[model samples]
Target chain A: DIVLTQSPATLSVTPGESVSLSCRASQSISNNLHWYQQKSHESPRLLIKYASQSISGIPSRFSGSGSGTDFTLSINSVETEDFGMYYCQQSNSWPLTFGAGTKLELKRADAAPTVSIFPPSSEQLTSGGASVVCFLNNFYPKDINVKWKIDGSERQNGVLNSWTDQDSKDSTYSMSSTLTLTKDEYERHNSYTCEATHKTSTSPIVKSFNRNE
Target chain B: SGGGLVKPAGSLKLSCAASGFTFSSYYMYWVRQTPDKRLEWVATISDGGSYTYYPDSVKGRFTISRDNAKNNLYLQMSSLKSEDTAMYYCARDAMDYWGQGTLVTVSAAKTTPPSVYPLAVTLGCLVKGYFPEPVTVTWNSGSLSSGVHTFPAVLQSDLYTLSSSVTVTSSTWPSETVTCNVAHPASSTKVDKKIVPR
Candidate 1:
C-alpha cells in the first residue's frame, strides 16, 4: 500500500565501522517498518521489527530509528557476517511495499583515487555564470565525497551527480562534481577550490584556481 | 505439509503419500517450478514401482523410492544449488491429484526477469524474480504516462514479482512503442521491456 525508497543504492564499508542505511516512504506508514538481512544462498532473517524493536538472538549492535515516512537501520559496529543486503518493508497498508535495497558489501580491495580540477572556459565566463568541475577517477568502493570551496568557505549542492564509470571491464569507478556559480560570484571570488575525499586516504586532495592570476 | 529452510550444498527428502486412491496402481511424477515460472519434470515412477524414469538433465544425485504397502513415495535430492530453489510437486497418473507442493529453498535467493505479457494488454508488464520486494517500474522512458494501474509485488520462492497495465488512447499509437522499466536491487542497471501492437 506504500512505496518505500532506499537510499545510497549501494554501500560499502569495512568491518568494525558503524553505518546507517535510509528508507523513506511515499506517505505516512506509522511504525510498520521491518528490516531484513539476506545472504547468498540463504533465507533472509528478520533483523528488526517495528522500525527499532530487536528480535531474539539478534546482535545488540543492530538497531533502527525514525517513524512515519522516514526510517533508518543502523549498525553499531558491522561484523563480517553483517555484509549482505538489507531491505526495509512497510506493512502498514494494503499492498505493502519494500525499498529496492541497500547492499552491505565489503569495501573493494585497496584502491586509491586520483583527482583533477577543470576551470570554466573564457566563453562560458559570461555565458551563464561560471561552472567549475572536479573530475575524480580510478577509485573503488564508490563513496568518494567531492567538495567545492569558494574563498575558503565550503559550499553544497551544485553537483550533477556521482558514480560515473571509467572501466566496465574493470571494477574501478570514476565521478565528477560540478559547482555552479553566478556571474557576479565567479568574477568577484579571487580563489576557488575543488576537493575530493576518498575512503582510502586520510587527507583530501585539493586543487585551486585563482581568478586574478 | 512442505517447505523448509535448508542450508546451502545440502540434501533434502520430500514425501508424497496417497490413501483413498491406490498409490501403486497409478504412476507417480515429481515436478518443480523455477523462480522464473518455468516447470521442470524431475522424475517419474511407473505403476506398482515397476520402473523409474528421469530426464537427462538430472543424471545424478537424484533417487526415488516407494513403499507400496504404505502407499507412499519419496524423492531424495542432493548437492543442491541456489538454482534448485523452487516449488516441488508430486502428481499421479494423467497429472491428476497433485500434492500441495513442497518449497525447497536450497538456501537461495532467485531473481527473475519481468514478463511483458498483456492481461488483455492495453500493455501489461509482469516483473519477477527480484528480491527485497522493491522495484521502480516506469512507462515510456518515465514520460507520457497517465491513468496507469500497478499491481503489488508478490513474494514466492524468496523473490518478488509484480505487474502493471496502461491503456493507450489513440489507435494510431500502435506503431509507437510502450516500455516498462524495472529497476531492482538484483542488477546494477534497470531492465526494461517493450511491447507493440500488431
Candidate 2:
C-alpha cells in the first residue's frame, strides 16, 4: 500500500494541545510513509503522507512532512477524536512493521477515567465451509511463533507451517496455520484458533474461528 | 476527479468520505481479486498520513501513501515492469476489505522512477489461481509432488495479482513440485512451482 488516510476524531487531550499523528505500511519501507490513529474496537486510521501533500477534502489543520526516509504526521489542534492510539507504519521490508500504538490518555483537567465494552458480540460458525482463521495483523521482530488450538486444548500434530512476514500489509506480526481436520479431529473438537506468540509481548492474542455445528 | 470506488473503464468513479469514521481511526488498506482470482493484498496507508506499500512488490517503483484527515490513500507506480505489472489496490489491517482494483499496463505505468532491485530482479512474486474443477501445477516436464506454499493476494478495482511460494523439507527426497488447488465461491484453477530449499 502506498499511503493510508484516516478520518479525524476527538481524542483524549488538553483541548487546545496538538495531538500526534500515526500510520503504517504493508512492509518495512524507508522511502514512502503512512499515518494512523485509533479508537475503541475500531482499527487505526490514516492521517497524511509523502510529506504533507494533502489528500482531497483533508482538513487544512492536518499536514505531513518528510521524504526518502524519516517522516511525521502533524495535527494542528488535538480534537476529542484525536485521542485513542496514534501510530506510523513504514512500508520498508520484511516483517512489515508499525510503531507501538500511542493511546489517548485523556489529558483532561478533571482526569476522569471511563472504560467499557458495551457491545457484546458473538461470531457463529455454520455448517459447510465454516472455518475459523485468525493471525496477527503485523509482526516486527523475527522468530515470532504461531500455533493453532482447538477448544482450549492444544492441537499440535496436524501440520506445522510458517510464512515470511515480509510485507507490512498483513500486519507483519502474524503466522497463519490452517487445520483441515479429518472427521475424527473435526468431530472431536468443534473449534479452531490461530494464535501468535510475539517476542515483544508476554501474552498472545488468540483469533478463534469455530467449526460449524 | 478522485474520491472513493472506481468504476470499470468508462465506469464512473464513486467517492466515499464517511462522516462517522475519521482517517485516524483506521489506516485504510485496499485488497482486491478478480471474480475467480486469488486475493492480492494491494496498497495501504493512513487516511491522510504517510506510509504505504505493495506486498511482495519486488519493484520499488510502486508509490504508496495516504491523507488520513480526508480518508484517502494514493498508489502510483512508475517504470512498471511486466512482473511489476498487476492490479493495483489500497487497504488497511484486520482483513480490511478492498476498493475495486485498478488495472495498469506496463505501458500505462511507464514513467522512470528509482528502482529497488536491478531492473531485472524486482520484488513480488508471480502466481496464478482460478476456480471450477481440475487444477494441476507441474514443471516444464511432467511430475507429481506437493509441498507447503505461501500465497499473498492483492486486489484493486478490476485489477488483481497473487504472489505465492512453496518449500518442502524432508530427510529423503531431492527436490519437488508443490501446487495449491483452490476451489471456492468462484471457479477452480491450480498454481504450481518447483523448489529445492536448504
Candidate 3:
C-alpha cells in the first residue's frame, strides 16, 4: 500500500494555458509512477507510464517527469478536450495505491456541441456483434440527444449515457453514446445513421454509415 | 487512540495496534506528514530484532521501541512543542502496508542567550532561545572563516531552549561576519540573527 498524495484538488484554467500536477510518495517509489486522464463518464486513459514514457494515442502535449518520491504530470497547453480529472498511481510494491485525482477544467461556459460516430473497422466486426461510439465533443448545458437508426427505422436496443467533460469552465460539456448492433442486423442494413439533436442547432445533425464497407 | 492535549514539558507516547497480518515478520516504520502535507520519516524498528534508527533531527527526543511479546509498536517523544503537531503513521517496509494514522500535537514551546565568546585565537557564537524539538541552525560567514557548529538535542529551557556555538580563529574573525539562521516549523520563516564580535 504505497501512499501517493496529490495536491490542488481542483485546477481551473483557460485553453492554451499550461499546467503541472504533482504526486508525492510516502517513501521513495523510484520510477514506478504513472498518470491517467479521466474524462466525465469515460474510463480513465493512461497518459504516461513508468514516470515519463508516452502512451500511444495520447496527445503529445501530455508528459511526465520525476523519480523516487516526487513526480509531476505536465500538460504543455490546455485544450478544450483535455479538461477532466487526472490521477497518479504507483506500481512499486504490492497493494498498489492511487492518489486522489486533480481535475483540469476550462474557465468558460459551454459552446455548441459537435457529434461524431466511430464505427468498428471491417476486420473487427467479423464476429457476432460490434459496438459503435458516438462522441459529442464541446457541447453546452451538459444535455444533448444522440440516437441510432437502421435504414431510417428507429431502434430502441442501443444504450446511451452522458458525461459532462468536467473540465469545461462553463456549463458546456462532452458526452459519449454507445450503440450495439448484432451481426445479423449490421449485415442486413444498407444504411445506419447517428442522429444528434441539440438546442443550439435547428436541424438534427446526422452521420450515416453503409454496411457494404 | 492516545488522548490528546499534552501539558508543557511532558511526554507524548502512542501505541500502534495492528492485526490481519504477521506483525513480527516485517520491518515496522514510523512516518508523519504535516497538515501542510509535507511528509517526514521519523524512525523505524526492526520486527525480528530490537534494533531501531531515528533521524538525527529527532534522535534524542524521540524513541521507537517494540513489545514483540504483545505484538505492539510504540513511539515516544519528550519535551514536545506546538510544531510537533502532525499525522503519524506506521507501515511495513517502505510503506508496503500502512496504518490509518494518528495525530500528534505538542501544546506550545525558545533559544539560549545569544552571545559570543573568544577563546584565545578562537571565536564562538552561542545562539539561544527556541522551542519544539527539531530545529536546523546554520552559519553564513560573509567572508572566509573556519569554524565548527554544534547544538545539543533541543533541551527544555523556559520553553525548549537550545544552545548552539561556532568556534573560529580570532585572526579570521573580523573579516568574517557570522549570521545565524535558525529554522523551525513553528516560525513562519527562518530566524536570522547576527553575532557581533566582542
Interface RMSD of each candidate, angstroms, one decimal: 20.2, 21.0, 29.9
Question: What DockQ values do the models have?
Answer: 0.02, 0.03, 0.01
Q: Which stretches of candidate 1 lie over 4 Å from their true place?
A: A111-213, B1-198
Q: What lDDT tens digits, residue by residue, belong to model 1 across residues A117-145?
A: 65655444545556665556667867788
- Report lDDT per candidate: 0.67, 0.41, 0.64
**Candidate 3 local distance difference test against the native:** 0.64
Give TM-scores for every candidate, taking all chains together and pairing residue i with residue i.
0.33, 0.27, 0.35
Candidate 2 residue lDDT tens string, A143-202: 556676678777676433334433323223223343434344455665566666665667
Q: What share of the true interface contacts does each candidate keep?
A: 0.00, 0.00, 0.00
- Tens-place lDDT per residue, model 3, A6-61, is 87887878889999999999988899888867676444566888899877778888
* Candidate 3 chain A: 10-residue stretch with minimal lDDT: A161-170
Instruction: Residues B1-198, candidate 2: write the lDDT tens digits.
Output: 132222222122223243444557776655433222223455556544555545665335545555555665555544434433334444544333334445433322211111010000001113222212112223323332332223333331223223322223443334433333332222322232323222
Clashes of 3: 16
Alpha-carbon shift of residue A98 in model 2 (angstroms): 3.0
Residue-by-residue lDDT tens digits, candidate 1, B41-72: 67778887778877555648667778888888
